[PDB]
Amino acid sequence: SPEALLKQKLDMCSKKGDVLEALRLYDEARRNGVQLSQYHYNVLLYVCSLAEAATESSPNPGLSRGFDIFKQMIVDKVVPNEATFTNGARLAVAKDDPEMAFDMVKQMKAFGIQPRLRSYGPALFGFCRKGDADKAYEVDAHMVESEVVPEEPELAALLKVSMDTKNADKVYKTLQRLRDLVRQVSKSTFDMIEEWFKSEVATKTGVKKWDVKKIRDAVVSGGGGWHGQGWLGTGKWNVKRTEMDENGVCKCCKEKLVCIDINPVETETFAASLTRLACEREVKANFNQFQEWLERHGPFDAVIDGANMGLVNQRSFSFFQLNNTVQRCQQISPSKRLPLVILHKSRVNGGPATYPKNRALLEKWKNAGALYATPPGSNDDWYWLYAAVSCKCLLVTNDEMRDHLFQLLGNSFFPRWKEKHQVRISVTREDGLKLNMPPPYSIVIQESEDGTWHVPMSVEDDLQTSRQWLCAKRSK
Ligand SMILES: [Zn+2]
Numbered sequence: 001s002p003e004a005l006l007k008q009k010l011d012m013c014s015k016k017g018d019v020l021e022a023l024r025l026y027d028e029a030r031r032n033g034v035q036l037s038q039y040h041y042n043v044l045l046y047v048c049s050l051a052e053a054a055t056e057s058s059p060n061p062g063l064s065r066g067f068d069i070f071k072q073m074i075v076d077k078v079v080p081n082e083a084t085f086t087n088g089a090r091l092a093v094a095k096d097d098p099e100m101a102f103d104m105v106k107q108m109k110a111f112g113i114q115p116r117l118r119s120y121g122p123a124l125f126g127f128c129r130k131g132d133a134d135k136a137y138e139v140d141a142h143m144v145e146s147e148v149v150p151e152e153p154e155l156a157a158l159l160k161v162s163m164d165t166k167n168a169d170k171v172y173k174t175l176q177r178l179r180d181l182v183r184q185v186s187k188s189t190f191d192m193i194e195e196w197f198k199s200e201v202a203t204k205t206g207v208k209k210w211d212v213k214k215i216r217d218a219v220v221s222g223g224g225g226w227h228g229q230g231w232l233g234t235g236k237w238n239v240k241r242t243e244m245d246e247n248g249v250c251k252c253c254k255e256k257l258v259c260i261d262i263n264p265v266e267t268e269t270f271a272a273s274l275t276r277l278a279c280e281r282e283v284k285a286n287f288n289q290f291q292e293w294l295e296r297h298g299p300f301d302a303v304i305d306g307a308n309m310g311l312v313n314q315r316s317f318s319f320f321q322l323n324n325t326v327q328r329c330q331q332i333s334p335s336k337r338l339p340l341v342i343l344h345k346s347r348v349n350g351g352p353a354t355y356p357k358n359r360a361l362l363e364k365w366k367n368a369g370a371l372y373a374t375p376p377g378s379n380d381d382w383y384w385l386y387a388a389v390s391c392k393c394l395l396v397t398n399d400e401m402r403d404h405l406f407q408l409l410g411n412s413f414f415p416r417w418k419e420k421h422q423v424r425i426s427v428t429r430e431d432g433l434k435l436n437m438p439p440p441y442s443i444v445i446q447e448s449e450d451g452t453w454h455v456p457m458s459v460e461d462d463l464q465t466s467r468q469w470l471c472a473k474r475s476k
Contacts, residue, residue: 003035006036010022010025022043022048036073045066046083046087048063048065048066049094051063053095059095066091071107086118098124099135101123102123105123127161133162152181155182155189159189163195168231178445180412183443184443194470202237203237206233207234215232224258228447232450236475237472238475239470247441262413278382287386302340303395304322304384307344319351322341323361325396326365338365338370342387343371343372344378345376382405397424401418424436443467456469
């Protein structure tokens, strides 16, 4: 079969990295009237990615013709799948022509195809590297229109190009986008923001007088912690690296940060999504049986990730650490409720429970309506997540909650819910175990009603390392 033959020959062409032969085989299929499939086109897009940008001649046929092949696949109305977007982007990156990368995205739109975030990258970053803000903002507007949401790298690039071209309005807007979408910024972005606030353009932007009611109504309207009405005040900024104390008080300026509310409607949307995602991955009857059990149990003040409590910082499962965490949670519960312990059934039956009194205790918790043993093959993460969300209560786990399945939960609501609900344990020699409670303020970029800014750096473990903030306050 000829379609099937071209495949074999393109799969073979190549592990070898032979672009000139893939381009020959491409042309031959069209001379033979063999219609290229999704698969053929993808391999061909990949193979062309391997070509390099001619630093000393007119561009090479591999990259150059790669864009041609891309264009033709779309004309042919061959549907793109995830590999198509990836390879198309590699091709764009390798070529490093932002205008040609932008063309590929325009072509996709013209044929009713939704570009991916990675499709926009080579265009956005290309224009930003070249200092072409006007084109960078075109790409940004295109992405907004296609409903593709930027991540921190795209925002930071937009921030820097706005700084480079002295555009104080676009800096403001991008900082608001960082607040809304990212919350806590990387070391790179943090340093960039610090430069912005100490810069001549920042010193020279602002207003001496403004409508206080306008700001007040914007604060209420935006949900808290910002106003979005523009730079306030005048003159040089005092810009310091600082920390918040445990109550959210800036150690530099003594402003107390805001605790920003989560809208209960968002929480109910998230709970529905969580249940849908869990039932796609669990045996549906197993998850449903837990949902039904939970409906008949509680109330709960806390839910414990039993496997994480037994294992975090241990060389093997510590019933001590789990049990001490149960006791601690019950002690801080105003009415002394036992926490809901989520644990695999395997664990309920043999170390923990190697020792008869530990096994009896596990059964006692179950009998108290405070332990659910998840069935073999289940991922218990869905279970403790769903319980904490549904019971609207604390979640005790030191799981990072960022990798694998946790990426499925998104990067707006879930991180905000996490900060309000997650309790983590720490241990010291002098004191033993401690529960680290949610902060009484929101760890996010905040803009105060008088235009003062507080910007938090993102950190891997804010109990291990002390989180740095930027305090930017007008000097007069
Ligand atoms: Zn401050």
